Design a protein around this ligand. Structure first.
Ligand SMILES: [Cl-]
Ligand SMILES: [Cl-]
Ligand SMILES: [Cl-]
Ligand SMILES: [Cl-]
Ligand SMILES: [Cl-]
Ligand SMILES: [Mn+2]
Ligand SMILES: [Mn+2]
Ligand SMILES: [Mn+2]
Ligand SMILES: [Mn+2]
Ligand SMILES: [Mn+2]
Ligand SMILES: [Mn+2]
Ligand SMILES: [Mn+2]
Ligand SMILES: [Mn+2]
Ligand SMILES: [Mn+2]
Ligand SMILES: [Mn+2]
Lengths: 371, 371, 371, 371, 371
């Protein structure tokens, strides 16, 4: 069942969107709220099209309304971090992804980009590249997956993965609209597929260098939510939307450095993985917005997943925590895939943990300060 | 009853599809899954429009999710085989039909194109031409034919074949969209008609030379599934969707060589047919994805069909296994029609069997190796 | 689709029908209108329960409202002919079947009972017995048969005749209610069955002596219409409600005399049939309210019917105009079945024609006067 | 979705059924049609309540309308075999289960009772007792199980077997009505349970001696169909209504003789089973109306079933062809259960095969004549 | 939204239930399945009304279908434990609550009554009395509470507790039917009220002596499930059906001995409570079918609940783990209320834990063997 807003005449809205807007420009400021997994937005009018992110003014909002502050000093600040073209309003309107700061200009608790950028600047010469496979499930407003029988289940899994046809793929209109919307916005979207669970989908973001991975994925998530809002359905990043023999949603992260991409870079890939072998618990905590409880429902070691309590790595191992692609093993260079991160992970937390363990050789149960 | 996805606002999707996509190009990789009758697809982003099939990278997928592998080494490989223009995304986006290979680069079990291409290259000088009349039935998501009364039947057969009017043709919107989509994509689609069963239709693919017959028909099937997915109905290639006095769906194959097309080519047509007379059982096994059990429900010798257990040929014989058209008999040259193949046949299997029996003079119950 | 009246709360009506009515008695006067196939009724209050038909007063109605008169002298008269218990109002209320007379006390044009009674009194000593198998079709208010798919057809005929189950018998609630209502009223109803056409049914009336056959069948028809009115569906006696391979409705008439029932009564059965052989056209005109045009659609000689233009008789011959039952042939006594009469026949016309031809040895194209 | 007849006001019908019917009695004649699995019925009026089965007259019907005859001599004969009280019409109305005979008084092809009674009379002194567990599935008129999501599936099997609650048991109203209707009719119904498949149920018939097993089960099936017709749903005895991981429906047959019931009767139980071990193919053909093709879909050896191609017996073996109950093994006396027969089996065929193999020591592939 | 079974005509079922059943009697055998919280049932026919529980035969079922066994020896045994009058079938039909035993006659894992009865027999002279306040929530088949707005919430809590009116009490028809059904069955039901959460209700069972507390509550739960099944809604005993500011469901247990009920019995009440003070963790594990995880969602110390991690007792303390009623404090005698147990608790586990701690002075983390 789709939302009441989706039943409003879309024809009418278009007619208003066809009006020439004139000299004023709309900027939509996007930020992460106090849950560390929700996105918030609002719009301001600018006098002219900004040429770069530097021209965008800082803004503010009430943190007590976003689970981000309490009491008197609840005013929070928005500092623009990345700019994109607005696919919902078209050029010259912009999407402005912002960092959140408290009233005293300290980073907000869900502001993970502030530290993530400092870590990325530390290893800039090694040029870390990331890719994330964002899995998501389309849901009706009733909390049941989009397209599934009322209070019931479709046929067993098997035909839905990369499926085509009215009985195989549910809500491809949303997937096509999102893909185009991301390409128009300047998001580094690498592809899409239908997932094993019906009404479950995936888009790939990358390759992205350093802090660009978190910006591109967060804005790609925002566009998906905004596109799904137009169609009147919900995109969930819950790692296990439906209990039982229905696939979880993960965010598989591909990681490579300049050394790993160069000839005979497999030795550096293996060195990074054995470093990851010794910090499995540290990464599980970082790979989930609430410390790894959500990912416990997904990482059961059954549905092409690994076990949350046990670390494993191998070439072409779908069930392993870390997978080296078969081609990467043959070519002796390229990347490796971390399959642990949950679909509702913060990419700033995930990328920072990979750099700290693999590149800065950090150890122990707490992140190093100033290094 | 049409699917929940078909009830999403199509206006909205269009608005996103009207965005200029920019420099990136979408390629949809299409392959045959482990059932030998189902199609799978997913999309990747390319940096630029590929000029030919050679520029497309090889890709991969999980075979355990497509009924094509089990256990550890379930990664399969996609090798592009034919390129077409994407009618769902428009130029410069592409449809990429691929062959499937196992982890050790051996052909997949449902990869029949690999052997079919080798056979076609063997008889290239004789220039074999094919044409296939693909019959299909439109169905609602409930498994009942599109347009038929709820839990009931329309009037008896007689007015539906090539019918026009709301009470004669069911789901012509899908037929028109598919026809155009195929013409835009570069599929060699020769025409369409309404079939004797209401909601049953047919499109002709050809003439196609050698391996092009399987590529064009498989992609034409994919476009039909994708077009039907947009309208929220199902296209079935079941050889007998409805039991009783309702027509089956076949894939009648027209075959000719350079010798048969030349003046007094009827003698070569008759020589090919008498060779087919001695291998009826071998062809029945090849003409069906599960060895000829599905086609047993269609080949009953009643509804303009032949008997599955008996071979027959004649000029202008609709009830025969092989038909020589009346014009071909008069002109003493042209083609002959194999009416045996089921609607859910693999064209690679059908074309290969015709070349082996008629052109390579193969005998016995198993295909010759290396010849 | 059932009528708006059927959607009124039946619970409420019952509550009013549970009131004790007291000393006054309701009599429903029933008569045949000017179409010769429609029934009309209205109710009057009596001071007390009538002990016999003789105690019921004569009544009147406006003939211009029943297709039975025009101009100034349109008042018609109702003379009670047969009394029955009212199954819709229960004892002591009555159903009063009446003959219709013009303003000058001459019989109305659709009053066939007046002449039929005189003929029956002429052959009273021979004690003619009749039985009629009244076939009818239940229809929705839309003119489509009850239970059939909207604007469509059920499966082919074969499982519906005497069928049980939700997919075999349509509207058995009406059949059960009618059967009981007739038994309560004192109608000589001999049994029921589901017919070959789905939603088609039959009840048997008889054996009835002389004029009782027309009274019992006409009142049985009235009760069926009144019972169907309660359920909000229509009972049609159309001889061919649906064109094509769907069975017609007939009213098969069984006829025997005292001579035919006695030992070695087959010789008298054969003598009656050979007399019927010479008057096929006279009986076809009498067996239909509009001279035999309706029965032309049924008597096609295909669906267990005979040909309207040709007479035939035989033992156990379903396709014959006249059938001698196999048991009657073996026992050399009993009855014979006239299968010619249409479902919308007037039983007074049918019984009178059988007596005139078989017992009074009448010949020619017009009924004898005074004999 | 329930039938159009089920939407007619049941209140109204009751009001007519509350009328006192008077001196006339209704008898519903029930017989098996030409499919050997379908039941047919019709009603006649009797002058008085029959005291025993001997007082019921023989009747007849058209065999060409029941798949039981063709051409001229299509009249078939009904000979009453067992009488029961009518639960749909109440006392004194009767249900009359009849044998079918051709025009020349030879048994009809689906008349298996005629031979079954002769075999039972042969072993009368050994007093064979039978019990059958009739499994069935409730279905909507759309051919989907009653209560299941539209075009979908309920949760996996596990909670439905003997389940209580709106999410566990589907259509218990039908089960309760059938159970009572059978108890009122005088059917030897021993109990009911909810089956593993949701909307699937079972009733036990027995213990019944000799020919009474077929009469009681066939009439119990008729009452279920008639009760389901009232509720507007379909009872199917298809051995595998839904493909996949959904339980089949069987008719498990319990068999014991006077010797097997007596002290140390286990030796006679084992002797009967080893005789059954040598005739597995003969029994599989008899245990299915179409020679064992339907039961091939059920007897897969997976869902608490045995393999159709392999015979096995054991104590407390659910997966065996023949099961000796654990209590019977301990007490060294009682019965054994044949778990092979399909839900749509003819009990006359099943009981006759058990007596021929176990008691008459018949061998070979054809039944013995006159013994 | 109510179930498809609830939409079947209840009038029809009644008509069948009005048939006199005759000499045979129905017994419904009820048992606890392998989840320790679900109930299963099936029916058998008895020859006569059983006078006591001793006359009921032992029965059996397949444990592999009830989550209670696996592999070959999956047959389980039902031993009748308590008898009640059947409120769904009326006298003389019975409800038979049974204990479950394995194939080797050892108690089933969810058979807690076997040990509970032995403990109750040990302290029989002290005459322990119990009372349980069973809270439950009515839910639609969609998993949303009965009566709540579609995908939404009613007004805040405050008017629903003991509320009257269409906007205050949801599904009182079920509560009235259950209350009467329990009184007819012979269940010791002491009263009902509407709970603070709308669509949430409670019934009190008791006072019951020893093992009667578990029998009465389990059968009361079965009747509620069966009554809710008739109305087409679900009764859930989930301790927290809806997250947030919506009340949990508990099963508050009242406990008293002969000493506590006698004059100046408060000293024995205080001695029992201080013994309970030292075994808080042991009781939390016993008070929940899955070791206390479900009750963690309810025992938050906010909505009139206590904290799961902390024990507290006091006079008239709603927020305490143990409450002494104000009247009991004043009269210096009576009972105390354990407010810890979850709504889905097993009463056999709860009553046994209270007797072991308070009366048998058991200590440690495991129950004493043989004492
Ligand atoms: Cl905004
Ligand atoms: Cl895709
Ligand atoms: Cl009136
Ligand atoms: Cl009937
Ligand atoms: Cl039951
Ligand atoms: Mn994936
Ligand atoms: Mn991956
Ligand atoms: Mn065709
Ligand atoms: Mn053709
Ligand atoms: Mn008839
Ligand atoms: Mn007849
Ligand atoms: Mn069973
Ligand atoms: Mn059994
Ligand atoms: Mn309470
Ligand atoms: Mn309390």
């Amino acid at each position: 069942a789709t939302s009441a807003s989706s039943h409003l005449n879309k024809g009418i809205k278009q007619v208003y969107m066809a009006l020439p807007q004139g000299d004023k420009v709309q900027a939509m400021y996007i930020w992460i709220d106090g849950t560390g997994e929700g996105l918030r937005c609002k719009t301001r009018t600018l006098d002219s099209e900004p040429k770069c992110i530097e021209e965008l003014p800082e803004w503010n909002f009430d943190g007590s309304s976003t689970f981000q502050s309490e009491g008197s000093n609840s005013d929070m600040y928005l500092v623009p971090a990345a700019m994109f073209r607005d696919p919902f309003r078209k050029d010259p309107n912009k999407l402005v992804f912002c960092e959140v700061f408290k009233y005293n200009r300290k980073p907000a608790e869900t502001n993970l980009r502030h530290t993530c950028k400092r870590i990325m600047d530390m290893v800039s010469n090694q040029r870390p590249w990331f890719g994330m496979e964002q899995e998501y499930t389309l849901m009706g407003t009733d909390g049941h997956p989009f397209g599934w029988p009322s209070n019931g289940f479709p046929g067993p899994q098997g035909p839905y993965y990369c499926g085509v046809g009215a009985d195989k793929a549910y809500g491809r209109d949303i997937v096509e609209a999102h893909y185009r919307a991301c390409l128009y916005a300047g998001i580094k979207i690498g592809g899409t597929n239908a997932e094993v669970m019906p009404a479950q989908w995936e888009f790939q973001i990358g390759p992205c260098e350093g802090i660009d991975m978190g910006d591109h994925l967060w804005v790609a998530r925002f566009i998906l939510h905004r596109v799904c809002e137009d169609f009147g359905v919900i995109a969930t990043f819950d790692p296990k939307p439906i209990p039982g023999n229905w696939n979880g949603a993960g965010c598989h992260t591909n990681f490579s450095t300049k050394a790993m991409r160069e000839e005979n870079g497999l030795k550096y890939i293996e060195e990074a993985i054995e470093k990851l072998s010794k910090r499995h618990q540290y990464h599980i905590r970082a790979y989930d917005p609430k410390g790894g409880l959500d990912n416990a429902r997904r990482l059961t070691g059954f549905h092409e997943t690994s076990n949350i309590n046990d670390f494993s790595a191998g070439v072409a191992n779908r069930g392993a925590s870390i997978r080296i692609p078969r081609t990467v093993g043959q070519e002796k260079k390229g990347y490796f895939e971390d399959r642990r991160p949950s679909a509702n992970c913060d990419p700033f937390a995930v990328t920072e943990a990979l750099i700290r363990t693999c590149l800065l050789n950090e150890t122990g149960d707490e992140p190093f300060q100033y290094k």
